Amino acid sequence: VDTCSLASPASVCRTKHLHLRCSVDFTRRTLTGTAALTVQSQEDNLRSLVLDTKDLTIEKVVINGQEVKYALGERQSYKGSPMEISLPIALSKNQEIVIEISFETSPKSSALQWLTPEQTSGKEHPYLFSQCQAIHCRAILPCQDTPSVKLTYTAEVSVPKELVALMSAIRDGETPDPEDPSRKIYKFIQKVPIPCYLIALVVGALESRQIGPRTLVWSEKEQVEKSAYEFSETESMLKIAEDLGGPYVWGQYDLLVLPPSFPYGGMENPCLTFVTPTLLAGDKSLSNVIAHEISHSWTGNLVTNKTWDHFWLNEGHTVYLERHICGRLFGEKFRHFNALGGWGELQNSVKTFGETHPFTKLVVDLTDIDPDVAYSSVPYEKGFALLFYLEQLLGGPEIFLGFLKAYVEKFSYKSITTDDWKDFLYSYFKDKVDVLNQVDWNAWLYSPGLPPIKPNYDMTLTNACIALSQRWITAKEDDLNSFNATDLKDLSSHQLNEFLAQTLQRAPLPLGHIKRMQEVYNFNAINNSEIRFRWLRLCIQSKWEDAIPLALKMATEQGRMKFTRPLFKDLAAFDKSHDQAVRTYQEHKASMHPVTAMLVGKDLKV
Ligand SMILES: COc1cc(O)cc(CCc2ccccc2O)c1
Ligand SMILES: [Yb+3]
């Protein structure tokens, strides 16, 4: 049973399709419209069902052309309020009805950010966007808000005519509003059954330019040139992901580069991946995020996790594919380098939570836990680590990729659990059941802390990062003169970032070493968001006052949670800046993405 959802479970009824016809109102910061759900019954004699809702105003519910009775339950925190609909005629098993619910969103909807014009690049027009992973789709519309249910949908969206609307679906045409000539209706069809966390909307002044045979890049006009350059290897990545995954079943693959308040690096919305504009490093150095979003097209969007207790199935197989893409493009030694960094970030998450803390288990139990609160790098890296370990044990990359394609093939258009994964892994590796029983499964799946085994890693590109970091850390004042900008000359931006990751793991350092590091490396000049973030974290943790305004400036001007939350956290901890960090949050709380705003307020103990 899906514990994070209050709707009737899939064992009762199943949404097959959603028709949504809505209207984006920027004066009220609301979406208003109707959600017509086509619901099949799974039982005999079905007379009622519950849907998920959150801060939605419900005007009425119409089945068979007539208003039916319904009741809203009391709010249950982050879960929202259940919405029971009294059905007018009892359904037999497999009977299908259409429920059309007239609704309105609240401006406080946790799934949406309402951007004023000054918060955009252009400064003339407003912007709005959505993030429904994990359980915020109920903040947009009543639904069975669980990934245990997949549905197709269609939409018609009325927006200011000067604006443009996109969704996670095939764009199905645009027309002016028959009822209101100042507006446009844009239409969307999604023919592939999807879980509702992938429903996506963005409304703004968008421009497009084509970067491949199935890719257009979407953003504000100021951002299109840079976006088209930065993501020009997407077709190449797709061809690899198809060769490893099997056919791409979604048709198009467009990329939308969002404003900086977007809280994730990416979101794998079918046909329209959302990406952070912090990926625009000028050099395609952060292209692995695109490889993560492309990979989700199979592992995530096709093979879906039945519940959020099994999210690792989403992220771990995806991180496994993403590094496989990156491995093709740039070499097997590069895959291992990324893999090893991954274990590095897993070390930090376990250090941060504590090695016995429940969110460090691969499979979590999310009863009474906001998924926004549990979100970490753990499910990505522990999932990846498990799959890497399994690769090595079971005969290396070629064989484990055979398992991975069969896995997509085997579970496409379904929502699975960990036993469904492990059972199939066992059916596939019939001849290696002895190898598999050797694996310690309770530990990998259900024990907290680090995995019980570490897989073998090639060290070739990593050894240079570890060397320079150790040189800095074992340096005493009288060695600091020997550091020089030629220390970095054979370092890729990636090894550089790994050098800072290595160093940050041992923070703090003497103020003097940091001062010197700036002096000869000019890290401050670097605009790569990964490098800068770690360099800034290193400076604040090492107590450098000069870095307060920079780290502050990064924490607010962008809003990617991977960077924003540790920056406010480090700053809260540093005595000299603690009070500016709290006051800066409170100055910008209103203007922040609601989930980011929530997590930073808790992080800051406001
Ligand atoms: C951005 O997508 C998510 C949003 C959330 O609020 C929560 C999640 C996943 C929650 C989760 C699942 C499994 C293991 C750890 C974990 O944090 C994902
Ligand atoms: Yb010395």
Structural domain boundaries of the chain?
12-204, 205-301, 302-459, 460-606
Q: Which residues contact 184 (CB under 8 A, 6 or more apart)?
A: 158, 159, 160, 161, 163, 165, 174, 175, 176, 177
- 3-class SS at 532? helix
In the CATH hierarchy, which fold is given to the domain comprising 302-459?
Neutral Protease; domain 2 (1.10.390)
> Do residues 277 and 559 make contact, with C-beta atoms less than 8 angstroms apart?
no
Handedness of CA 245, 247, 248, 250 (dihedral sign): negative
- Confirm or deny that 83 is annotated as ligand binding: no
Number of helices and strands in the chain (H, E): 19, 22
Q: Is 380 in the pocket of ligand 1 (CB under 6 A)?
A: no
List of residues 6+ apart from 487 with CB closer than 8 A: 468, 520, 521
Q: Which numbered ligand comes closest to the C-alpha of 358? A: 1
Query: How far is the C-alpha of 157 from the C-alpha of 201, rounded, in Å?
Result: 9
Domain 460-606 falls in which CATH fold?
A: 1.25.40
Label the pairing between strands 183-195 and 201-204.
unpaired
| 364 C-beta closer than 6 A to ligand 1 | yes
> How remote is the CA of residue 491 from the centroid of ligand 2, in Å?
27
How many CB atoms within 10 Å of residue 540?
28
Exposure class string for 123-137: b at 16+ Cβ within 10 A, else e? eebbbbbbbbbbbbb
Measuring from atom 17 of ligand 1, which residue has the nearest CA? 375
Is 268 annotated in a binding site? The answer is: yes
Q: Is 389 a catalytic residue?
A: no
Which of ligand 1's atoms lies nearest the C-alpha of 373? 6
CB 223 within 8 A of CB 121: yes
φ, ψ (nearest 5 deg) of residue 263: -85, -15
562 Cβ inside 6 Å of ligand 1: no
- Residue 167, φ and ψ in degrees, nearest 5: -145, 175
The 3-state DSSP composition of the chain as helix, strand, coil percent (nearest 5) reads 40, 25, 35
Q: Could you tell me the fold of the domain covering 205-301?
A: Zincin-like (3.30.2010)
The rounded Cα 171 to chain-centroid distance in angstroms is 23
Ligand 1 touching residue 379 (CB < 6 A): yes
Q: Is 86 in contact with 62 (CB distance < 8 Å)?
A: no
| HSE, side-chain direction, 13 A CA sphere, residue 444 | 23
What letter represents residue 5's amino acid? Answer: S
Q: Report the distance separating Cα 107 and Cα 66, nearest Å.
A: 29
Confirm whether residue 554 is marked as ligand binding.
no
Angstrom distance (rounded) from CA 485 to CA 479 = 15
Cα separation, 568 vs 582, whole angstroms: 8
Distance 230 CA to ligand 2 centre (A): 45
163-167: long-range contacts at Cβ-Cβ below 8 A with a sequence spacing of 24 or more?
163/125, 163/203, 163/204, 163/205, 164/203, 164/204, 164/205, 164/206, 165/24, 165/201, 165/202, 165/203, 166/201, 166/202, 166/206, 166/218, 166/254, 166/256, 166/272, 167/199, 167/200, 167/201, 167/202, 167/272
State whether the beta carbon of 133 lies less than 6 angstroms from ligand 1: yes
Residue at 43: amino acid letter:
E
Q: Which atom of ligand 1 approaches the CA of 308 most closely?
A: 12
Q: Are 219 and 178 in contact (CB under 8 A)?
A: no
592 is in an annotated binding site: no
Give the residue, out of 269, 375, 593, 596, with the most ligand 1 atoms within 8 A of its beta carbon, to mutate for a pocket test. Answer: 375
Catalytic residue among 293, 322, 381, 391: 293
- Tell me if domain 12-204 and domain 302-459 are identical in fold: no
Task: Answer yes or no: 293 catalytic.
Answer: yes
Residue whose token pair is 């096709």: 302
Rounded distance from Cα 476 to ligand 2 centre (Å): 6
Return the ∠ at Cα 399 (arms to 377 and 458), rounded to 5°. Answer: 55
What's CA 522's distance to the chain center, in Å?
Answer: 32
The angle that helices 234-245 and 311-330 make with each other, rounded to 10 degrees, is: 120
* Strand, coil or helix: 547: helix
Q: Within its chain, how far is the Cα of 100 from the centroid?
A: 30
Strand partners, 274: 256, 267
Alpha helical stretches, state H, 297-377: 311-330, 332-353, 371-374
The answer to whether 359 and 376 are in contact (CB under 8 A) is yes
Q: Please tell me the distance between residue 11's alpha carbon and the centre of ligand 1 in angstroms.
A: 24
Ligand 2 midpoint to CA 479 (Å): 6
Report how far apart the first and last C-alpha atoms of the chain are (Å, whole number).
35
User: How far from 421 is each of 52, 307, 566, CA to CA, in Å?
Assistant: 28, 13, 34
In whole angstroms, what separates CA 372 from the centre of its chain? 11
Q: How many CB atoms lie within 10 A of CB 546?
A: 11
* CB distance 135 to 308 below 8 Å: yes
User: Do the bridges between strand 170-176 and strand 183-195 make them parallel or antiparallel, or are there none, so unpaired?
Assistant: antiparallel
Looking at CATH, the fold of the domain delimited by 12-204 is given as Immunoglobulin-like (2.60.40)
Give the determination technique. X-ray
CB 447 within 8 A of CB 361: yes
CA of 516 relative to ligand 2 center, distance in Å: 16
Q: For atom 11 of ligand 1, which residue has the closest CA?
A: 375
Q: For residue 358, give every residue at least 6 positions away whose Cβ sits within 8 Å of its Cβ, in sequence order, or none.
A: 364, 365, 448
> What's this structure's resolution in Å?
2.3
**Candidates 153, 380, 521, 585; catalytic one:** 380
In the 8-state DSSP scheme, what is residue 269?
A: -
**Which sign, positive or negative, has the C-alpha torsion 326, 327, 331, 334?**
positive
CA distances, 313 to each of 18, 404, 408, 472, 522 (Å): 26, 12, 12, 39, 41
Q: Do the Cβ atoms of 378 and 346 come closer than 8 Å?
A: yes
CA-nearest of 9, 8, 33, 39 to 21 is: 33
- What CA–CA distance (Å, rounded) separates 184 from 164? 8
Ligand of minimum distance to the alpha carbon of 481: 2
Ligand 1: residue whose CA is nearest its atom 18? 134
375 CB near ligand 1 (under 6 Å): yes
DSSP three-state, residue 65: coil
4 vs 79: CA distance, rounded Å = 7
